[PDB]
């Protein structure tokens with residue numbers, strides 16, 4: 257007749273919701289889309305081994321919608337489904353510790369995430385969504401599948417898709433605490449005069465255009481609207497890091513003068529990322545592969561630098 | 572007092588007057604009678620903007636101080652922006668939004684989009700800039716801006732199923748939702764995506780991916796610039812990755828090109844970066 261078991265559904269693995277299930281129905285019928293440790297179990301009927309387990313459902317009642325928002329800080333209805341679908345893959349990657357950092361053995365065209373994950377472990381960053389804070393702790397410890405799947409979901413990228421690092425840090429920074437970050441710039445044009453500007457949030461820690469923090473501090477040449485080239489330079493920065501990005505170009509990472517950088521060999525549709533880190537010397541981390549050198553020149557796209565408080569001396 | 576111009580609180584901390592940062596200015600006599608640091612302002616601000624960035628309002632105000640000085644003529648029935656401050660990407664975005672079926676979630680974007688369609692896009696422009704985390708005058712990209720705004724749009728009814736056939740692995744159907752359901756990066760042609768484009772598979776071979784099923788009111792196809800009544804609209808980019816200019820192409824009674832200026836033609840070939848197509852329900856025929 258009626259054969260049934262007890263489960264918990266959840267969206268955050270924090271609030272669990274007891275349900276009973278008629279074994280005579282596949283999970284979807286009773287819950288909608290249903291997952292077991294990443295596996296889409298919507299179309300399976302309950303096993304005796306399921307008694308007492310926990311299942312992610314979708315926020316299909318008002319209570320779950322609010323819990324999901326408090327945990328993930330997103331209101332895209334498809335977020336949890338897209339996250340779970342990614343997790344079915346990221347749980348299958350291997351995440352070896354290479355030079356003290358969690359990287360990822362190459363799989364499923366994930367080179368940009370490996371380099372993002374290594375970068376994330378070297379910069380001062382506290383996340384706001386509890387899901388990312390929790391998954392990031394796990395990632396730093398070496399169990400990074402959930403972290404990788406959440407980055408994919410927040411970035412609207414699917415498993416196997418070609419990725420760009422600059423876009424990922426910007427997406428993640430929208431979800432990071434940059435409250436104390438401050439950037440002050442002056443732009444001096446021989447025609448137009450001087451203009452100071454203050455920037456906040458992601459733009460206060462990100463600049464696209466030069467890899468050299470020294471050149472940014474000294475002044476970089478950009479076009480002015482009057483037609484002249486003006487020079488823009490950094491007057492004041494209060495932040496724990498900066499990220500500099502540019503189209504891939506041959507570049508000289510010198511030991512000890514930056515934190516880490518990303519190297520891109522390829523073209524705009526297909527290319528490969530490697531991570532370069534400055535430790536006692538220069539290490540090139542490529543998934544599980546590791547190399548060392550005293551100097552480096554290669555096709556660099558992003559350079560990260562340490563910071564606390566900077567004020568220019570150029571008046 | 573206010574953070575949203577809807578919920579008012581009788582009364583400072585950070586203070587703004589019609590876009591100009593006046594926190595550090597003292598009131599003038601002409602000012603008589605006219606940041607979210609308490610719970611009333613925190614709740615009102617979140618319900619209106621759908622962001623919890625503490626710095627959001629400062630960047631929105633800074634942008635509005637500039638965008639209120641732009642001019643916004645109606646060209647071929649759409650609000651554009653007369654050129655100022657390297658706003659060609661913002662101009663092309665505003666012309667594009669008014670031409671496809673899309674519903675916003677933050678009350679701020681619906682309200683600003685409605686005002687913009689009527690001709691008052693200053694508030695709308697400061698909101699686009701804040702959501703895309705750009706300051707006024709910055710060089711912008713259509714694909715990136717659209718990715719951020721679609722992140723803030725109701726694309727809930729959109730669904731996409733694709734199949735990938737690899738000579739080693741077999742066939743795999745994959746389902747996408749939200750932004751990935753309406754955007755494809757790799758080809759400008761919806762027809763080729765429906766018929767199939769060759770892209771890499773995880774085993775290292777190049778595989779062929781084609782569209783099995785699409786349910787949505789529009790699609791956006793983008794690719795790096797190349798020479799290129801069959802589409803709704805597209806963006807044309809002249810330049811290189813660091814410096815260039817956007818124009819807009821709309822397919823109506825003929826093909827019209829709006830560049831902040833407007834011309835027409837019966838045929839069109841140029842350096843296209845993004846192309847837009849109409850949809851309701853499409854299903855492929857390889858069965």
Ligand SMILES: CC(=O)Nc1cccc(CNC(=O)C2CCN([C@H](C)c3cccc4ccccc34)CC2)c1
Nearest residue numbers: 418419420503504523524525557756757793794795
């Ligand atoms: C719109 C569209 O069609 N996107 C698309 C299509 C197919 C595959 C991919 C996935 N690959 C990417 O997204 C890349 C994007 C960025 N770059 C670096 C940072 C890079 C930066 C600047 C200039 C570059 C100029 C040349 C090469 C790289 C440049 C890394 C990879 C994306």
Ligand SMILES: CC(=O)Nc1cccc(CNC(=O)C2CCN([C@H](C)c3cccc4ccccc34)CC2)c1
Nearest residue numbers: 463464524709710711712794795796808811812844
């Ligand atoms: C904080 C700050 O200042 N950020 C900043 C700085 C500089 C520039 C920009 C924005 N950059 C852009 O908008 C262009 C860049 C990319 N694409 C083009 C279509 C494009 C697409 C694909 C391959 C390409 C391959 C080669 C060339 C172009 C390619 C769109 C426009 C932002």
Ligand SMILES: [Zn+2]
Nearest residue numbers: 445448480482
């Ligand atoms: Zn000038």
Ligand SMILES: [Zn+2]
Nearest residue numbers: 737740772774
């Ligand atoms: Zn394969």
